[PDB]
């Protein structure tokens, strides 16, 4: 119920939206650090994905933190120090000391505090980003009472963007971390653009006349404490109210009680049987794998050929063994038709095809509108028919500088007459004279006997509807075969035995990557089981077969006797014969429907209130 912030800037009101971001796990075993004069503990904590800094302040002890990789003037590091005058944020190669501290001196003659020692960094060589805030005055006084202010900070380092969420909440607890819920909001975004893996807290050092000795021993430590958390990426539900502030949150990985709210998308859970998931690990990284034939596809020649074939004989070229960069295809701003049936041009950079076929011919303006799947005319019926389930689209543009000469260009011949309707993706080259009446037409060209091929009149001053338009037809095929032609997307490294969502040759799913000993035929690419789910992956970058282990595989039934009624729930495992369970718990009972934990068993026989299965009934009693 702590560390919850706004993961997006989109305003939501009375809508529960599931988020997958770096969030603080519920009831985590966070580390506790204490600094009591009576313990100046300033360790270096690892920065895996994010650290939630929980600390309560009563005398302005904690000032800032040091962020970097090595902190030895060898890599780029981020400095955050909150002095008594201004706030200094710099990105330089600082040489940080072993135990950095800020020294504040106190005078017996006059009750005033003034920082005197600044021992944080030795020197800075090269600086990239520097931030200076407005000046302000802080009293920097010591309090003999209990804690008053609590400061919460969330650190995130994604794609070089440093987002810090802070919130001030007044508390009166002495030592224990306060409970309840808080909402955190961004205040500034820092484009540091560096890799940070280690960090250390920077406190304030107080000196006065009550601590005799040298500089290294003559000092006292203020009464302060802080806690260090970890941001594990887990799915969460956040309750966005009408004011835009999150008043409560729902976990999906702490307990089966929490995950029941996650599946139902509601904060209140009534009585019933719910199936959320088995023992489930939230995904942390993401992987994409595509074939690595980094070769440009040759459609730049088909779109720029020196000459184009006729309509009755359209040249078709197979495109394969290359990556198809469609960014130079739908962004040319020089074509005239891009109605793409089925798939969308925005998804052409993601999908993978078995092979790409590119037809080509030249057509007039009036017949460029009738090359859709369901259409009729003298072209779609006799010359070029697309299937009703056609994938891909035609591309046409004006051809007046080329293929347009005075006196008429009669080189092309379209099929004006034909005996029957044309089958889809069929090319007809036949010059036999078509007859109409019962008179024989054995090669004659008399009455009721016309040449099936009619020439075209292409003049530079002809009408726009009769201008010759160069038409190229891209067709995509999806067959049970490895995809030799894919989008220009790259491929990351391959991970194993970890619940990681994957992107294999255009197929996206979440699971655990495990080695498979099954022998896979070269014709097939994907393996499907009886349940019709993905089981085998070819992985064309390495050409090895991996078995997809589901992250959740067993059946879990959560016996929840309401939310306000009781906070105790029972977990029933269907595939477990009482381990791969959420928790061991107590009162483990094995029934015919499976293994039930968290619920007691009695030898009596009462009325069935909450059925379990196979005659087993459970109820909430005293």
């Amino acid at each position, epitope marked *: 119920t702590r560390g919850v912030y706004y993961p997006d800037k989109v305003f939501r009101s009375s809508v529960l939206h599931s988020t997958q971001d770096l969030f603080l796990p519920f009831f985590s075993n966070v580390t506790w650090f204490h600094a009591i004069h009576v313990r100046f503990d300033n360790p270096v904590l690892p920065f895996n994905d994010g650290v939630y800094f929980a600390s309560t302040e009563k005398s302005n002890i904690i000032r800032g933190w040091i962020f970097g990789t090595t902190l030895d003037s060898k890599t780029q590091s981020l400095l955050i120090v909150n002095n008594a005058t201004n706030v200094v944020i710099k990105v330089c190669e600082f040489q940080f000391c072993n135990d950095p501290f800020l020294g504040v001196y106190y005078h017996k003659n006059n009750k005033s505090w003034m920082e005197s020692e600044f021992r944080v960094y030795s020197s800075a060589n090269n600086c990239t980003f520097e931030y200076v805030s407005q000046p302000f005055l802080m009293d920097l006084e010591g309090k003999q009472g209990n804690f008053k202010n609590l400061r919460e900070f969330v650190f995130k380092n994604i794609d070089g963007y440093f987002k810090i969420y802070s919130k001030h909440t007044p508390i009166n607890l002495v030592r224990d971390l306060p409970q309840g819920f808080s909402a955190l909001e961004p205040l500034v975004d820092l484009p540091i653009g560096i890799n940070i893996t280690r960090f250390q807290t920077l406190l304030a050092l107080h000196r006065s006349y009550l601590t005799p000795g040298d500089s290294s021993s003559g000092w006292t430590a203020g009464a302060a404490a802080y806690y260090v958390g970890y941001l594990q990426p887990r799915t969460f539900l956040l309750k966005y109210n009408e004011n835009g502030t999150i008043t409560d949150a729902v976990d999906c990985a702490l307990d089966p009680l929490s995950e029941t709210k996650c599946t139902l998308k509601s904060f209140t859970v009534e009585k019933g049987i719910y199936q959320t998931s088995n023992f489930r690990v939230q995904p942390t990284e993401s992987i994409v794998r595509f074939p690595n034939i980094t070769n440009l596809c040759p459609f730049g020649e088909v779109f720029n050929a020196t000459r184009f074939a006729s309509v009755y004989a359209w040249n078709r070229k197979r495109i394969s063994n290359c990556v198809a960069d469609y960014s130079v295809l*739908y962004n040319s701003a020089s074509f*005239s038709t*891009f*109605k793409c*049936y089925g798939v*969308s041009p925005t998804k052409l950079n993601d999908l993978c095809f078995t092979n790409v076929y590119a037809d080509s011919f030249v057509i007039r303006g009036d017949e*460029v*509108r009738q090359i*859709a799947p369901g259409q009729t005319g003298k072209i779609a019926d006799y010359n070029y028919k697309l299937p009703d389930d056609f994938t891909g689209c035609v591309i046409a543009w004006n051809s007046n500088n080329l293929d347009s000469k005075v006196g008429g260009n009669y080189n092309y011949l379209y099929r004006l007459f034909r005996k029957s309707n044309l089958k889809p993706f069929e090319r007809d080259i036949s010059t036999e004279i078509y007859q109409a009446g019962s008179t024989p037409c054995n090669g004659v060209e008399g009455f009721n006997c016309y040449f099936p091929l009619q020439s075209y009149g292409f003049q530079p001053t002809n009408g726009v509807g009769y201008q010759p338009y160069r038409v190229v037809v891209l067709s995509f095929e999806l067959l049970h075969a490895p995809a030799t032609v894919c989008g220009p997307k790259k491929s990351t490294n391959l991970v194993k035995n970890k619940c990681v969502n994957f992107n294999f040759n255009g197929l996206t799913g979440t699971g655990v990557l495990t080695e498979s000993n099954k022998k896979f035929l070269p014709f097939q690419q994907f393996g499907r089981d009886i349940a019709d789910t993905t089981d085998a992956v070819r992985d064309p970058q390495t050409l090895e077969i991996l078995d997809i282990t589901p992250c959740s595989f067993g059946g879990v039934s959560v016996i929840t006797p309401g939310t306000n009624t009781s906070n105790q729930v029972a977990v029933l495992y269907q595939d477990v014969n009482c381990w791969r369970v959420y928790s061991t718990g107590s009162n483990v009972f094995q029934t015919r429907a499976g293994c039930l934990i968290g619920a007691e068993h009695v030898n009596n026989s009462y009325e069935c209130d909450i059925p379990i299965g196979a005659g087993i009934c459970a109820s909430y009693q005293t």
Partner: antibody, heavy 120, light 110 residues
Framework: QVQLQESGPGLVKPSETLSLTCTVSGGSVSSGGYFWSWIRQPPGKGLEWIGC???????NYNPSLKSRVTISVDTSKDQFSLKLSSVTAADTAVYYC????????????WGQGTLVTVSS | NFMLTQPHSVSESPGKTVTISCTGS????????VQWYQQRPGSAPTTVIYEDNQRPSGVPDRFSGSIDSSSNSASLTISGLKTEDEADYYC?????????FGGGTKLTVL
């Protein structure tokens, strides 16, 4: 997600220079190869398309309002602006800036409607 | 010289269907797709129907779209009207180095 927030004064003198700056936050102007464009609409009338831009310097303009618009992309500030010259009294309209997922695709994400009025 | 023509104002009783037609002037309508927008007053227009009949997330199933190359017109059909459907409607298509729009059909309910 990503959103577009417009800026610039709403009071322009006739036959002067107009300067509107649409700032995009939560995303990258150069990355993705997305087309940024401008759309205006007179009050009570239909929408009018002004011009489109790429992440490079390539620009497309409407033929009716040609030789009056100059849109540029500032990748350092992650914003794209517009420059209108010789503003007439009929140019009083709500100006919009919209990202395009595709060159001839939908203006999927729109900015808030800013009011620009031509008055002396 | 391509422009889109639609009726200026089309109104219908609630509970029935209504058809809004967008017709091109010179060029064909079967190329470079079409887009439908709904502009609530005092707000930016939002996409309702894109592509032939594709619909973005957050748009009800009542908004149905179809094309007609023979009539050179694009049709948007709304069934089961509501108070929130009272807004300006626009049709958008693409031409050579320019994007075209329409006059704007003002739909009124009740």
């Amino acid at each position: 997600q990503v959103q577009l927030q417009e800026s610039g004064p709403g009071l322009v003198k006739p036959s002067e220079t107009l300067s509107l700056t649409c700032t995009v936050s939560g995303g990258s102007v150069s990355s993705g190869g997305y087309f940024w464009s401008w759309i205006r609409q007179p009050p009570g009338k239909g929408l009018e398309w002004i011009g489109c831009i790429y992440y490079s310097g390539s620009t497309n303009y409407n033929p009716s309002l040609k030789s009056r618009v100059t849109i540029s992309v500032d990748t350092s500030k992650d914003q794209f602006s517009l420059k209108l010259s010789s503003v007439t009294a009929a140019d009083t309209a709500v100006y919009y800036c919209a990202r395009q997922l595709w060159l001839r695709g939908r203006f999927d994400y729109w900015g808030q409607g800013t009011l620009v009025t031509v008055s002396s | 010289n391509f422009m889109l023509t639609q009726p200026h104002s089309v109104s219908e009783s609630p509970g029935k269907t209504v058809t809004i037609s967008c017709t091109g002037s010179s060029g064909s309508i079967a190329s470079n797709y079409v887009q439908w927008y709904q502009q609530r007053p005092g707000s930016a227009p939002t996409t309702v129907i894109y592509e032939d009949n594709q619909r973005p997330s957050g748009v009800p199933d009542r908004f149905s779209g179809s094309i007609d190359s023979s009539s050179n017109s694009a049709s948007l059909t709304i069934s089961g009207l509501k108070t929130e459907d009272e807004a300006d409607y626009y049709c958008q298509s693409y031409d050579s180095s320019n994007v075209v729009f329409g006059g704007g059909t003002k739909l009124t309910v009740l």
